[PDB]
Amino acid sequence: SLSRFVETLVVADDKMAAFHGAGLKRYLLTVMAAAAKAFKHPSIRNPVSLVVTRLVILGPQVGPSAAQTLRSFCAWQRGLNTPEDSDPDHFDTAILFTRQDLCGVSTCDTLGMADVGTVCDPARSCAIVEDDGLQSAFTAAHELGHVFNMLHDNSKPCISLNGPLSRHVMAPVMAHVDPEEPWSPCSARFITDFLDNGYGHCLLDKPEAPLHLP
Numbered sequence: 001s002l003s004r005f006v007e008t009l010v011v012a013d014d015k016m017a018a019f020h021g022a023g024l025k026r027y028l029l030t031v032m033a034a035a036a037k038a039f040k041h042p043s044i045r046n047p048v049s050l051v052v053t054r055l056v057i058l059g060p061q062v063g064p065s066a067a068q069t070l071r072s073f074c075a076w077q078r079g080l081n082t083p084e085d086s087d088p089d090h091f092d093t094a095i096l097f098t099r100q101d102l103c104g105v106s107t108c109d110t111l112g113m114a115d116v117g118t119v120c121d122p123a124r125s126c127a128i129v130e131d132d133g134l135q136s137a138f139t140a141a142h143e144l145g146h147v148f149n150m151l152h153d154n155s156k157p158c159i160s161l162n163g164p165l166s167r168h169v170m171a172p173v174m175a176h177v178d179p180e181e182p183w184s185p186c187s188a189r190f191i192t193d194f195l196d197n198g199y200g201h202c203l204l205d206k207p208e209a210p211l212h213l214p
């Protein structure tokens with residue numbers, strides 16, 4: 001039942017600034033509002049409030065390898081944070097949007113990357129998103145699902161939890177997301193356990209000065 005608030009640092013690279021220009025801040029808050037709406041959907045079972053508290057427009061090394069862009073960004077974002085959650089400048093997770101075509105080992109179909117189950121570890125609570133211009137909120141929600149310890153819905157543990165009957169955020173590839181069920185039962189279970197085990201202990205304080213859309 002506890003309200004959970006994820007104090008979020010949103011970062012946009014030079015490519016995002018070059019393309020969106022003056023409309024970038026509004027764009028990022030719109031994307032994040034949409035991701036936040038996903039995280040309040042009842043299907044998640046333990047809803048959380050994704051709150052933008054800091055917004056940086058650019059830094060870290062951004063290139064084709066998603067793995068090394070994520071590692072670079074995650075090292076870089078540490079520097080902006082503060083040691084204690086009591087500090088207003090402290091943030092719980094860092095998310096980077098870039099126009100760089102991010103790639104895996106064999107193709108560039110990837111749209112983002114995050115390490116799994118890291119949300120209250122400031123050294124590790126990181127995600128990167130390739131901005132496609134239309135579905136970026138869904139990619140952000142997928143990466144943030146991983147940060148909240150979620151697996152893909154075609155994983156073995158998820159088959160048992162979902163049943164037998166690709167329409168959710170944690171599908172392995174983007175497909176059309178069910179508006180009545182953005183999160184599978186597997187997704188809800190994994191975030192619920194993560195929080196029940198005390199891994200969301202940094203999500204309990206309420207942010208001071210959230211950034212709001214007009």
Ligand SMILES: Cn1ccnc1[C@]1(CNC(=O)c2cc3cc(Cl)ccc3o2)NC(=O)NC1=O
Pocket residue numbers: 104105109110111112113114138139142143146168169170171172173174175177
């Ligand atoms: C880790 N990795 C390594 C190689 N490729 C990856 C992937 C690829 N998938 C995506 O980029 C991506 C975006 C998206 C949005 C929706 Cl709604 C549903 C599914 C989605 O998948 N990155 C990731 O986060 N998981 C992966 O398998």
Ligand SMILES: [Ca+2]
Pocket residue numbers: 007085086087088090205206207
């Ligand atoms: Ca705080």
Ligand SMILES: [Ca+2]
Pocket residue numbers: 101102103108109110111130
């Ligand atoms: Ca890509």
Ligand SMILES: [Ca+2]
Pocket residue numbers: 005007085091092202203204205
């Ligand atoms: Ca916090």
Ligand SMILES: [Zn+2]
Pocket residue numbers: 142146152172
């Ligand atoms: Zn994934």
